[PDB]
Every structure is written in structure tokens, then in C-alpha cells.
């Protein structure tokens, strides 16, 4: 039954640079996470963004349009998990 | 054979500019960033720019931002870095570096090129 | 702000034929998004280990990168004289991407 240790973290981050969000969950089975930004599922198929190992999220070249609310998703057959942090780009 | 080149380095005045070239051939320039990176004599080593497929996303490090312009030109295959307010921290062997294209797709830079020498003072 | 890498030790001499271990520390954790480079003297440095554990595809089996969190190292086996060079550590998790300041490794 997943659960969350560390959640994303609020940030401001410069323009151009490169940010993550981490989402370090626990549970049985290994808990997948998933990201949404502002309620939708993030497309890691624009190749800025990159779901890598451990739960990470990494944005590349960073832009003012990536300002937004970001939602980890831990899943599992059981149930899932929810933990959400806010990104400030300038 | 993959091929990365630098010239256009040597030696400058405190505030000067310059303009560095890094010739590529033997693979596809057009499919992949680049990298600029630097070697103090010191010894220790600083990412100074990246550059993206098409041109159309840079990044800089605070050390270099304003001073430190970088473009491409994939129809002839050359990555420039353009430094003006050059100062004397700048002092750095400059490397052309390739950015590899990776499972999980991690940054890093699987080919190099030898580097140009450049100097700043007197 | 800006992510600290630490290399331990800054340098070291050893012998042929031993294994020698090299570490890097982060000021946080940057969940092994870590890259290793070798630059032998005179030359342009060449990636060795990415993502802190993956192995470089034309690179000798004798290297070795593990670690998670904020600590890493890489285990040189089976020390050869083509070894001698200096290793850095690089935090590619986010900008800017700081080297380690690179630890020289020698032959005794």
C-alpha cells in the first residue's frame, strides 16, 4: 500500500536551466510514479523531458511555460498515492 | 570516424573578445547537442554552454551569462562559442564535447575534441 | 544553492595490479544522476561511467560505478598503467553541473 516518503519540492529555477522533481516512494509492489503538470500527464515524449531513474522528472531547458503545479502519482494494484509541489520558472 | 576540431584560440587583453570554431564531421551534426567545456590550469573543469539540435535552446552557467554567446551552423557543421568581456578566469583549455544519446537518457558527453588554448592578460 | 560535488581523495599513487577506490560526495542527494569522465595528460577527457553505475560502452570492465543518494565512488580493479590519469565526478541532476574537482590517479 504506497505511501510517499518525499514528495516534490517547491522551486524557482532559471530559464534555460535544467530542474527535477523527485518522487521517493515505498510500498509492495515497487510503487510506479507517474507526473502530471496542471492536471494533465506530462508528454516526456518532448525530448526537454526525461522520466529517469529512482523517480525522477528532468526538464531541460528550462521555460516560462513551465511554471506550474506538478503532481507525483505512486501507483499500485492496491491503491495509489498523491504528492504535489509548485514550480516558479524565471 | 567521429571528428571534433576547435581553433581560433591564443592569447588576449583582459575585456577582449573572441570567437571560437569546432569543425565536425563523421557523424550527423544535425542530430545532436553539444557541448562546450573548459579546463582551468588548476586542472578543475566547468560546463560552459550547451547548444541543441536545431540551435534553438542555449544554456549558460552564472560564470559566463552576457559574455558568452553560442550558435551553431549545421549546414556546413560548426559549433561556435562567441566571448567577449573576457577576463583573466577565463584562462582555459576549451573543449567541442558531443552529447550522447542515452537509456535512461542521462547528460552526458561520449566524444570530445583536443581542445584550443586560451590565454587572458598582458 | 549551487550543488556541491566532493572528490576524495585529491590524489594517490598505487600499484599495478591492485584495486583502488575513488569517492565523490554530493551536498545533496542527487539520485545518481552522476557522470564519470577520465582524462589522461595531454588529452580530452572521455566519458567512463553515466547515470553512476552504467558502464561506457568502449570502456575496459575494469572500471566499476555504484552508489545512490549523496555518496558514490568508482573502483578501478586490476590496475593498469593506461589508468594513469585524473577522474571527475559530474552532478547532472540539475544546473549547474559542477565537476568534482578531479582526483589524480598514479602508478608507484
Known amino acids: 500500500g504506497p505511501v510517499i516518503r518525499q514528495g516534490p519540492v517547491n522551486q524557482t529555477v532559471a530559464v534555460d536551466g535544467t530542474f527535477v522533481l523527485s518522487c521517493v516512494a515505498t510500498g509492495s509492489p515497487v510503487p510506479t510514479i507517474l507526473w502530471r503538470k496542471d492536471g494533465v500527464l506530462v508528454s516526456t515524449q518532448d525530448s526537454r523531458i526525461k522520466q529517469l531513474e529512482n523517480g525522477v522528472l528532468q526538464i531541460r531547458y528550462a521555460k516560462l511555460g513551465d511554471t506550474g503545479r506538478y503532481t507525483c502519482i505512486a501507483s499500485t494494484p492496491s491503491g495509489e498515492a498523491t504528492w504535489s509541489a509548485y514550480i516558479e520558472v524565471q | 570516424e567521429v571528428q571534433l576540431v576547435e581553433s581560433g584560440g591564443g592569447v588576449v587583453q583582459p575585456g577582449g573578445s573572441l570567437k571560437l570554431s569546432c569543425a565536425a564531421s563523421g557523424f550527423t551534426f544535425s542530430t545532436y547537442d553539444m557541448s562546450w567545456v573548459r579546463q582551468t590550469p588548476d586542472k578543475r573543469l566547468e560546463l560552459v554552454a550547451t547548444i541543441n539540435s536545431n540551435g534553438g535552446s542555449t544554456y549558460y552557467p552564472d560564470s559566463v551569462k552576457g559574455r558568452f554567446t553560442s550558435s551553431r551552423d549545421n549546414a556546413k557543421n560548426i559549433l561556435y562559442l562567441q566571448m567577449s568581456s573576457l577576463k583573466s578566469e577565463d584562462t582555459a583549455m576549451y573543449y567541442c564535447?558531443?552529447?550522447?544519446?542515452?537509456?535512461?537518457?542521462?547528460?552526458?558527453?561520449?566524444?570530445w575534441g583536443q581542445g584550443t588554448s586560451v590565454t587572458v592578460s598582458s | 544553492l549551487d550543488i556541491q560535488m566532493t572528490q576524495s581523495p585529491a590524489s594517490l599513487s598505487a600499484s599495478v595490479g591492485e584495486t583502488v577506490t575513488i569517492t565523490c560526495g554530493a551536498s545533496?542527494?542527487?539520485?545518481?544522476?552522476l557522470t564519470w569522465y577520465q582524462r589522461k595528460q595531454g588529452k580530452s577527457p572521455q566519458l567512463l561511467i553515466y547515470g553512476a553505475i552504467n558502464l561506457a560502452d568502449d570502456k575496459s570492465s575494469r572500471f566499476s560505478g555504484s552508489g545512490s543518494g549523496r555518496q558514490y565512488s568508482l573502483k578501478i580493479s586490476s590496475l593498469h598503467p593506461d589508468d594513469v590519469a585524473t577522474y571527475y565526478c559530474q552532478n547532472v541532476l540539475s544546473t549547474p553541473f559542477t565537476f568534482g574537482s578531479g582526483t589524480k590517479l598514479e602508478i608507484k
Open positions: 545533496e542527494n542527487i539520485y545518481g544522476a
Open positions: 564535447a558531443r552529447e550522447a544519446l542515452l537509456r535512461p537518457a542521462y547528460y552526458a558527453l561520449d566524444y
